[PDB]
Amino acid sequence: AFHFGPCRVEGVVPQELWEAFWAVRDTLRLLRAEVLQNVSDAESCYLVHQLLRFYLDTVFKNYHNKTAELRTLKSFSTLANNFVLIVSDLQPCQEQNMCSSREEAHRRFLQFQRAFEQLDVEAAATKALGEIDILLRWMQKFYQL
Numbered sequence: 001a002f003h004f005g006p007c008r009v010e011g012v013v014p015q016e017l018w019e020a021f022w023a024v025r026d027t028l029r030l031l032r033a034e035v036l037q038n039v040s041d042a043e044s045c046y047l048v049h050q051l052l053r054f055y056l057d058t059v060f061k062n063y064h065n066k067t068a069e070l071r072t073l074k075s076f077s078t079l080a081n082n083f084v085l086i087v088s089d090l091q092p093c094q095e096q097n098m099c100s101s102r103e104e105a106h107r108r109f110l111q112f113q114r115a116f117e118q119l120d121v122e123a124a125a126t127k128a129l130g131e132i133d134i135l136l137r138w139m140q141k142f143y144q145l
């Protein structure tokens, strides 16, 4: 399962995320891999939750081309569904006050958001979708057998 600090996420595994991403990518830095690499185990619950919420609330919404044809919409939907299933475990860990969010952690999310907001939002959304490989390579560090 995934172990994002104290939060165990059981509904989704990396193989599912990767196969969903490659389908999305096939239809198509804000995230600094070096920054994500040094995020503590403890901080991971907050930061994964914040980033996946941002994808679900801002990125997919602002990516116009997801409705170009039904197969494309289905591919995007599969990927978003995987993110929702992860957040459905992380949200309760936050609302039971399980996940730390030190000032440093909020500032790492703000670094991402500042970069995203430099661009026109449709271009930003397109770029952020392309960077899901960065996100998933980081997230899978928290996946154990």
Ligand code: NI
Pocket (backbone or CB within 6 Å): 100, 101, 102, 103, 106
């Ligand atoms: Ni906090």
